[PDB]
Design a binder for this molecule. Structure first.
Ligand SMILES: COc1cc(Nc2nc(NC(C)(C)CN)n3cnnc3c2C(N)=O)cc(OC)c1
Length: 271
């Protein structure tokens, strides 16, 4: 649909950038209000920094992935500067929330609770035939009521024939990314499951960098041997073995996201 018909298009005047949350190479991120009262998050593209089509492809993707456990597209402004307006999450990114006094005080009970909400979010993605490709504590947002949601669908893709194969020279964060995706650039929902495994280490350690004291090559070198991440400090052994399922060598042997949710919920109530 063209902008004058798109239900997600709003006139820029309805918006009001109030507090800048981030500034990067490709644009900025603001906290603002829509029509005076509704708090929202605004992402603006830095004119010329990148393709407007590429910037907008994300919103277009979010129109297809609507769920309670996924950050929700609020609207767009398709004139320059382009805006992508989305649901506001009061407690910011998970990786940061876990480092605050509030986050620090969270029990393993609540840590498992949150892990289960993320997995439930990925289960919806899983079934709708999407992959995320960028799952990590940084890309999980936290609400004022301490609930978690999937965010940043920039790399996310729709899938027909099982897998999406990335460009030839594209590079991804090595620690969080499944071998087959690093090695062959082939992504499946099972690539996401592996990241979830890394995500659980981030949760249980309160946002610590996975594979402590290890460089990427040391990490690649250990995995190829059969090793996986050393049991993180203070980590229920149950949760650790779940981590291992996510880290099985063959993608098809790794669990579904639906199974993961179920498992974590049992871990949650049993405590
Ligand atoms: C400065 O850190 C905060 C971030 C967010 N929330 C968000 N944080 C980041 N992270 C940044 C990059 C702003 C941290 N520098 N995002 C990134 N993209 N969206 C967001 C977002 C949001 N939608 O609410 C909320 C918040 O409460 C006062 C504080």
């Amino acid at each position: 649909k063209p902008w004058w018909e798109d239900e997600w298009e709003v006139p820029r005047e309805t918006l009001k950038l109030v507090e800048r949350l981030g500034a990067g190479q490709f644009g900025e991120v603001w906290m603002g209000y829509y029509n005076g009262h509704t708090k929202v998050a605004v992402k603006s593209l830095k004119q010329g920094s990148m393709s407007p089509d590429a910037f907008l492809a994300e919103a277009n993707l979010m129109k297809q992935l609507q769920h309670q456990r996924l950050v929700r597209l609020y609207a767009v402004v398709t004139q320059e500067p382009i805006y992508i307006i989305t649901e506001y999450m009061e407690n910011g990114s998970l990786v940061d929330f876990l480092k605050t006094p509030s986050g620090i005080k969270l029990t393993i009970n609540k840590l498992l609770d949150m892990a289960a909400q993320i997995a439930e979010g990925m289960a919806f993605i899983e079934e709708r035939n999407y992959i995320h490709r960028d799952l990590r504590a940084a890309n999980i947002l936290v609400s004022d009521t301490l609930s978690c949601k999937i965010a940043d669908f920039g790399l996310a893709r729709l899938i027909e024939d099982n897998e999406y194969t990335a460009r030839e020279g594209a590079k991804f964060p090595i620690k969080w990314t499944a071998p087959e995706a690093i090695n062959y650039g082939t992504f499946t929902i099972k690539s996401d499951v592996w990241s979830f495994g890394i995500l659980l280490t981030e949760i249980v350690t309160h946002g610590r960098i996975p594979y402590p004291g290890m460089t990427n090559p040391e990490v690649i070198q250990n995995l190829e041997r059969g090793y996986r991440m050393v049991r993180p400090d203070n980590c229920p052994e149950e949760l650790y073995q779940l981590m291992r399922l996510c880290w099985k060598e063959r993608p098809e042997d790794r669990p579904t996201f639906d199974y993961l949710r179920s498992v974590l919920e049992d871990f949650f109530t049993a405590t």
